[PDB]
Structures are given as C-alpha cells and as structure tokens.
Design a protein around this nucleic acid. Structure first.
Ligand SMILES: [Mg+2]
Ligand SMILES: [Mg+2]
Ligand SMILES: [Mg+2]
Ligand SMILES: [Mg+2]
Ligand SMILES: [Mg+2]
Ligand SMILES: [Mg+2]
Ligand SMILES: [Mg+2]
Ligand SMILES: [Mg+2]
Ligand SMILES: [Mg+2]
Ligand SMILES: [Mg+2]
Ligand SMILES: [Mg+2]
Ligand SMILES: [Mg+2]
Ligand SMILES: [Mg+2]
Ligand SMILES: [Mg+2]
Ligand SMILES: [Mg+2]
Ligand SMILES: [Mg+2]
Ligand SMILES: [Mg+2]
Ligand SMILES: [Mg+2]
Ligand SMILES: [Mg+2]
Ligand SMILES: [Mg+2]
Ligand SMILES: [Mg+2]
Ligand SMILES: [Mg+2]
Ligand SMILES: [Mg+2]
Ligand SMILES: [Mg+2]
Ligand SMILES: [Mg+2]
Ligand SMILES: [Mg+2]
Ligand SMILES: [Mg+2]
Ligand SMILES: [Mg+2]
Ligand SMILES: [Mg+2]
Ligand SMILES: [Mg+2]
Ligand SMILES: [Mg+2]
Ligand SMILES: [Mg+2]
Ligand SMILES: [Mg+2]
Ligand SMILES: [Mg+2]
Lengths: 64, 95, 111, 110
RNA sequence: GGGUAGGUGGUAAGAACCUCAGAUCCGGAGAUUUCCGAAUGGAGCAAUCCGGUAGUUGGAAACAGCUAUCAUUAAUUGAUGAAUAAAUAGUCAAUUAAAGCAAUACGUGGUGAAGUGAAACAUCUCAGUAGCCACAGGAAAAGAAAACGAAUGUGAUUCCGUGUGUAGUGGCGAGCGAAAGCGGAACAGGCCAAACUUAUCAUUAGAUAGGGGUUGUAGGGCUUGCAAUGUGGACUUGAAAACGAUAGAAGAAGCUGUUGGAAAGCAGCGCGCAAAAGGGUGAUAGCCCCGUAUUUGAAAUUGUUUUCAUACCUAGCGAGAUCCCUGAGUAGCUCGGAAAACGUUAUUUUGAGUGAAUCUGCCCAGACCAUUGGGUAAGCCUAAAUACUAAUUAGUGACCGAUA
RNA sequence: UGAGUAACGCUUGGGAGUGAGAAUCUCCCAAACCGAUUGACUAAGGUUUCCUGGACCAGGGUCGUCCUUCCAGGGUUAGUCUGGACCUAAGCUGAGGCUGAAAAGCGUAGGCGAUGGACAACAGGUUAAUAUUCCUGUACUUACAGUUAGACUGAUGGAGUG
C-alpha cells in the first residue's frame, strides 16, 4: 500500500472544499520516496519511506 | 482384517440362478468403502477358500414410500459377487 | 419409594366401583396408572385377523381383561390390623436394616 | 459387575475374547440374514460385551488389532477341498495353454 | 454418587429378553468419536479421488493389511549456503503461536452515501446514520491535568438529573446545541527515559544486563546525617474454614348422605396448617395423589469470600553544594482539511514545508501584548460504577390464544 | 353467477376372454398412418420413471378390471467399454513477489482444467429385468518374482517423431 515501511503512517482522507462550499471526498497521500538504509555495514535494503522519516534518519546519522 | 466388510448375504432369483451349475457365485453386501482386494482378504480370513474373482455393484439410493406422510430415502448398497473355483460349494450358514 | 407397588392389595375409593379389593398386577409410573386384577373389566370387540402362524386361528371373542386405573383412586389395604381399614402411609427408616419401609399413620403396621 | 470380571482377566486373554466375539457376531448377523436366529437379543448382548471389553482394553494404552497382530495362530481344516479345486483348475488352465501354443506352432510350421 | 421395582426412545400393539450380586432413570467425572467442513499430504464439482515417509505383520516380490506423521505464515534456534573473498539473500530442520466460527446484541477504528427536510435547490440537514472492512473483550473505550475557570474556588476517568432548549452557532433559513457550576452512583493510583553508578561487549558503544528515579506549595541526581523496620497493594504459591451451584430425603389434616354415568359440587358433622402456590384425579378437592411452607443432605467437579504463612512491590523529616537530568523532526509557524455545540477559530488533530527553549525554562486563562494566576506536553498501564442477552435456573404479566 | 355453457389439445371395425360392472383392459384377425422415420444405438439431461404381482383413495380432460399413478418384492457384475490412477489447449488457481484506505487485484515457479493426444477383446448364448461386464470358445496388454540364453546399462537432460 501507499504507506511508510518504517512507521505505519498512511493517507489522510478529507474534504475538497471549493467556492460555493461543494463537498467532494479526497485523499492526501504521503510523500513516499525510495531510500537505502545501511545496517551494520550490510543489507542496504531500498525501503520506501516518507520525507519526514527520511529527515529523521538524516538527523539520527542514518539510524533505524 | 477386522471383518466388518461382510455385512449380509442376499438370496434372490438371480443369486440362486448363479449359485448352481459347477462354479458357485455367492452374493454378499459389503462395506461401501471397501475394495475388491479387501473383499477377497475377508473371504480368506473368514471362509478359507480364495475367490476366483470378485465383481462389485453400487445401488444408488432412491425415494421409498412416496406419497406417505413422511417420505424417506433408501440406503447405499455395495454388492459383491464372489465365485469359488470348480467343484467347491461352501455354506453361508454353519461354521 | 412409591405409594403403590406391584403385588400389594389395593382398593378403590372413588368411581362406580367402591370398595373393590384387588392385587396390583402392573404399575405404569410414567402415566400414573395401575392394573388391578378383577377391576375395570372392559370387553374389546375382538375382530379376526389372519396374517401369521398364530393369527391363523387367533381365537378371540368377548375376552374381558383389565383396564388401567389412575393411581390416585387407589388406596392401600391393611392386613395386620384386626379391624382392617384404608389409610395413608409413612416412609420411616428403621435403623435395624437402614431400609425405608412404608408404615400406616392411623396405626403402627408395617407395609 | 462385568467390568470387574474383565479387569481380573489379563490382556492377552482379553484380545482372545474380542476376536472370538467378533466372529460370533458375524455368525449371528449372517444367521439373521438367513432367518435362522431364534434368539435375536444375543446380537445386542455380543455388541455390549464387545464394547465393554474395548473400554477395559483402552483404559490401558493398548489396541486390539496390533496386539493380536504381534502373536497369533494360523488356520486349518479349510485347506483340503481348497487345494483340490485349485489343483484341478490350474491343471485345466495349463492343458488349455499347452493346446493353444501347439496349435499355433504347428500352424506356423506348415 | 442419588434412587428405586421396573425397563428395552415417539407414532406402538405383539414377539424376544433384561432386572433385587440392585436394572431403567437423574447428577458429577471420563472412554469411543466415520467423512466433509478453518481443513491444513496433493487435488477437487463438499461429504470424493490420488498419495509420500518411518515402523510392524503376511508374500517369493509387486502388493496388501495395522499404526504414527506429512499445509501455510510469523517468532526463536541450529545447519547449509549464490552472483562474489568474506558476508547476506536463499535453502533445510526443530520448537512455540496464529488461522475459523457465532450472540439477527453491546465496544473501538478505517471508509462512508442516498431517499428525505429546507414546502424548488447547490451551503446545510439527513448523518458520521445505513452499508463495507479490521480487531477484540467479557465488557470495551476513556483516564490521573502542559486541566477547568474567575475564586480566600474544584482537584483522574465513566454514567444519571439539572443547568436549558441557556451562551452560542446557522443561504442567521430549515435547524443544531454544549462547556462550567450544583445534586448523585463508584472511587485508586501506579510505572518507565534521562541524569549518577556497576559489569561486559577488536569497549571507537552511540549496545546488553543491574542498582538509582518518576515530579509542580518543582521533583530527582551530587556530598553529609537523623529516624525507619513498619503499613498497604490492582500482588505468587500453598493450608484451613464458611457461604453456594450441578442429583435428592422427610414433609400434617375426612367421613356420611343427595342429584348425578362419574363428586371433588351441595348439605351435615369434623380436622390440619411456617403447607390456602400449582398440577392431576370421570364436574368446582386445604385434608385422594404428586407436590408446596419448613428442616435437611454431596463421593466428584466448580464459583465467591475470610484467616494464616509465603514470594514481588511498597516508607519520613533535615543540611550543604549552585553543579547535572526532567521525553525534538517535538511544541510552534505557513499552505489545504478536519474535532469540538460552532459552517474552522482561541483549544485538539494532520497531508506537504519549515522549525525552537531548557526552571530567571515551556504551555494555558476565545485574536494579541504586558501584569497576575493555573499547570508541567512531546512515555506506558489502570478495577468500580456503564452497554447488551444467543444461553442456564426460578418466576411474573389489567400480554396473545390458531386470520392472534 | 356465467352454466351443466365453451372446451375435452392429429388414428378404425369385429370375434373370444377376464370381471359385479368393458367403445377404452388382455389375446386374435384385419384396417389406417410413419418408414432420412412414430424405425434402431448412444452423448447430455432425467434419477428408478426399468421387471414381476396386487390395488383402483387421489392423478389420467370421458371410462377403466388398465396405467410412465400407488403398494410389496426384485434389477445395473469390466485388466481391454466411458472417465480417473497418463498428458496438455482456451481458462482457473497460484507459495514467494508486485500493487492497493481495508476487503482485495495482478502475477512467477508449481497444480488443475477435454470438447483433443497416448493405451490391451472379438464372435455367439443366456434372465421377466444386465451384458465388448455373466457363460462358452479363442486372444491380447501391463507390472512382480524365480529361471535359461544373449547383451554394458544407458535419464529428471539434448534431438527426432508425435
Ligand atoms: Mg452533501
Ligand atoms: Mg464396476
Ligand atoms: Mg450405581
Ligand atoms: Mg440532498
Ligand atoms: Mg426539498
Ligand atoms: Mg416538499
Ligand atoms: Mg481498558
Ligand atoms: Mg419425597
Ligand atoms: Mg403429604
Ligand atoms: Mg385441588
Ligand atoms: Mg497555542
Ligand atoms: Mg462538524
Ligand atoms: Mg514555573
Ligand atoms: Mg483573556
Ligand atoms: Mg515534562
Ligand atoms: Mg399462525
Ligand atoms: Mg384458520
Ligand atoms: Mg368467480
Ligand atoms: Mg352452474
Ligand atoms: Mg349461452
Ligand atoms: Mg351453444
Ligand atoms: Mg362443443
Ligand atoms: Mg386427444
Ligand atoms: Mg377417435
Ligand atoms: Mg403409407
Ligand atoms: Mg425415434
Ligand atoms: Mg416416482
Ligand atoms: Mg410394467
Ligand atoms: Mg398390474
Ligand atoms: Mg376418471
Ligand atoms: Mg473378460
Ligand atoms: Mg489431469
Ligand atoms: Mg474426451
Ligand atoms: Mg434392456
């Protein structure tokens, strides 16, 4: 599914309000992007994570 | 082996027509899940004479007592036709 | 235990037959009935049926047998007492054999 | 009552009892199917005693077929007429076999 | 175990047996439990077909009986091992769990309409309802203040009444509608991270296993003393006792006459009651029978409570130092949505982006600033009151009595 | 009520018999239609409707002693036939895996899936009902063991044929 692999945070369903306040259901998807996380110098899996989790990994010196 | 695959012998016009004239043919009713080889083994372990060959019949269940207040179905029968060799004729009753 | 058993003398205290003394030949606990010989004589109109070795003759005319009677209408008959009377019974347990025995309440007679 | 008597019995004697009652049950059912069973209650009595013996035999972790498969006695009596009929039948079969090949062989030679 | 003198289930008579060495029957505990079905050796058109492996018995072998085992996924462990040296991916084996169903009922979460109303209709309502799906449990959810809120104030959560159809919110239209406070039901508060310290990992530890700590009238750590050996738990094993549940035992008291097929009706004379609830008995019986009030009883299984011991947790008030720790892609902010009564806004939440501080600190008191005051976010667990009845036992009805 | 009205959905005569009762049942003789079919063998489907005896509640568009109706008993025999234990086509399922708010969709290796391919039996007789199945006669095929003689055997893979 269109979801993170480190965390489980997924899409956010909401309303698409326009002028005249017309209601139409819409879905916000997470910014899934591919990244490779080294683990004990091995198993550099190409996991699909969000940019928020990517920033967390970057500030943690690639720790997960 | 357990010899629960020999339920009941049956005597009809067809059976008595075959059960005369040199080779005798004895018709029993057997366990519907039993095979021909099991039938031959049961006859060996309970009679003592090896059958020459065995034939099997499956009679399908059918409606009985139709129109009666409570109608009922029949019971599944497997018939086995043992044929002993020439000149031998054993009795189904008396051992 | 049971108020009425198979064998003891019994009489009827209600109905057309009053003071009918008899011996109980058989007790149906489920239907609360009791067959007493000589009492409740009914005469089924015996037909003729011939489909069996015994049915080939089955000689049956005006055979009078026994009809079952409700157990409530029955009452035990006293024998030990010199003047016999109809009464109710207890269920005392005597410690000599530790077995329950019926005893009348208008006298001291066992069974 | 009966369960106490069977408990007194050993295991091997119990398996002898079960096989004998199985045979007697088969005979009773066959006689009933031939209309020759005067006493029709012995079928039920045989089955109950069979069921009881199975219960006592299953209290201990022992089966009834395997235990009798380990040791047993063979059969007898039902041998003489069987071998006579079989010998006659195979002799006839070999005579037909011999005659057929000869007929074919002499036909091909000619 | 109870309990007897009958029993072999109903349409059901008869034939033949069983039963006083205690049958049938009732209760507790077990035994057996074919095939399909989550179905799970493989398949398949469900109740069928086709097998492998390891044993054992017959055969001279094929073979045939009789047993046990053989699905997938996840976790742990061990062995083996590619591209490619090492190492992983992968492969195999062993152990432990998961699958499914139902209670036409309650709970949580995700998704989520329309008929309809507004006398049309698009904002709105219907309604976060129906439906679809996931996960349970015997309840679930919630929960111990970065709170309410305007005071010499209350001090987890939940549920009921009121506050009130109030303040408010609404093409200010149809409509929607709290949070305080007050009166009640029940009541309980606990525990981690970091400091500091111990031991071990090529100790590059930034990791593992222990001691120490759990906060707001700030708490804890650092150093130095006094007083303590207790009280209480949401807590483990046992022992004993009590109250029950699953069969039962005992259980009082009436005759005569009359109509009548039949008395129990009616009449006369009586009797018992901690029993005058009810059912049957040839009409309408307190005293004919079964029962009921009342007194009792359990070999075996099981429930609640109490006592004793036993584990685990659980403990106060000072002094000095002025040093350290207190939960970060977090709180805020911007762009689109939503939750709250609110149609988005102080408070809560998040799809994208950005991004702080460290008790003279941070958040809150309906934009916002200053003063005053309140509280300690970014970690976890939490009984009770609350929701419901497919089922078991007892019972009730100004509920129905074969078109109900 | 319509109303004892419309309708009774393509096929004649006679003789003898049964029976309480006969245009309707049984037998016989004709007669009339089918005859690339109303004839015979089977697939699919139907599921006992098949054979014998009895009955005439109901059903049969009349009648009925009779029925494909009802009751009681009986009937379907395979190494060679039709299908599995052999193989694949369209297609289905599908461990891993990919995709997707959830349910799920797609899909690899494997596994199913005939309407096709490969595989050994023919003639006659017999019962009221079965017959390449039972019986008689004559055959064939595939496995296993022992034995005789000869030969080095050669697949989970390659190739040809199919
Ligand atoms: Mg709308
Ligand atoms: Mg066959
Ligand atoms: Mg007993
Ligand atoms: Mg609308
Ligand atoms: Mg409208
Ligand atoms: Mg309108
Ligand atoms: Mg909870
Ligand atoms: Mg009693
Ligand atoms: Mg009494
Ligand atoms: Mg009464
Ligand atoms: Mg704020
Ligand atoms: Mg809203
Ligand atoms: Mg402060
Ligand atoms: Mg203000
Ligand atoms: Mg804090
Ligand atoms: Mg009804
Ligand atoms: Mg009616
Ligand atoms: Mg009309
Ligand atoms: Mg008329
Ligand atoms: Mg007219
Ligand atoms: Mg006319
Ligand atoms: Mg006309
Ligand atoms: Mg016609
Ligand atoms: Mg005509
Ligand atoms: Mg013509
Ligand atoms: Mg034709
Ligand atoms: Mg029929
Ligand atoms: Mg016929
Ligand atoms: Mg007939
Ligand atoms: Mg007619
Ligand atoms: Mg043949
Ligand atoms: Mg296949
Ligand atoms: Mg085909
Ligand atoms: Mg035919």
């Amino acid at each position: 599914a269109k979801k993170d692999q480190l965390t489980l945070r997924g899409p956010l369903y909401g309303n698409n309000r326009s002028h005249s306040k017309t209601i139409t259901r819409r879905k916000w998807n997470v910014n899934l992007q591919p990244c490779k996380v080294k683990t004990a110098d091995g198993k550099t899996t190409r996991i699909l994570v969000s940019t928020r989790t990517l920033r967390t990994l970057k500030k943690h010196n690639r720790l997960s | 082996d357990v010899t629960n695959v020999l339920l009941k012998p049956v005597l009809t016009e067809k059976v008595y027509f075959n059960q005369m004239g040199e080779t005798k043919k004895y018709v029993f009713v057997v366990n519907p899940k039993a095979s021909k080889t099991r039938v031959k083994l049961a006859f060996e372990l309970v009679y003592g004479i090896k059958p020459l060959k065995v034939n099997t019949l499956i009679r399908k269940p059918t409606t009985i007592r139709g129109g009666s207040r409570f109608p009922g179905l029949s019971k599944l029968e497997k018939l086995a036709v043992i044929t002993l060799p020439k000149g031998i004729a054993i009795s189904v009753t008396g051992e | 235990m049971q108020r009425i058993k198979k064998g003891d003398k019994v009489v009827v205290i209600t109905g057309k037959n009053k003071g009918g003394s008899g011996i109980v030949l058989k007790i149906m606990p489920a239907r609360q009935q009791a067959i007493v010989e000589g009492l409740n004589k009914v005469t089924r109109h015996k037909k003729k049926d011939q489909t069996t070795k015994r049915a080939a003759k089955q000689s049956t005319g005006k055979v009078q047998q026994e009809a079952p009677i409700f157990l409530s209408k029955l009452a035990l008959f006293d024998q030990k007492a010199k003047q016999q009377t109809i009464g109710k019974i207890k269920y005392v347990m005597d410690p000599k054999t530790n077995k329950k025995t019926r005893v009348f309440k208008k006298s001291n007679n066992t069974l | 009552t009966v369960a106490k008597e069977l408990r007194q019995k050993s295991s091997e004697e119990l398996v002898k009892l079960v096989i004998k009652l199985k045979g007697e049950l088969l005979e009773y059912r066959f006689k009933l199917a031939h209309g020759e069973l005067d006493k029709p209650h012995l079928i039920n009595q045989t089955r109950r005693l069979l069921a009881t013996i199975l219960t006592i035999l299953t209290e201990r972790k022992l089966n009834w077929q395997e235990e009798q498969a380990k040791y047993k006695l063979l059969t007898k009596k039902t041998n003489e007429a069987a071998v006579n009929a079989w010998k006659q039948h195979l002799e006839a079969n070999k005579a037909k076999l011999l005659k057929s090949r000869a007929k074919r062989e002499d036909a091909s030679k000619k």
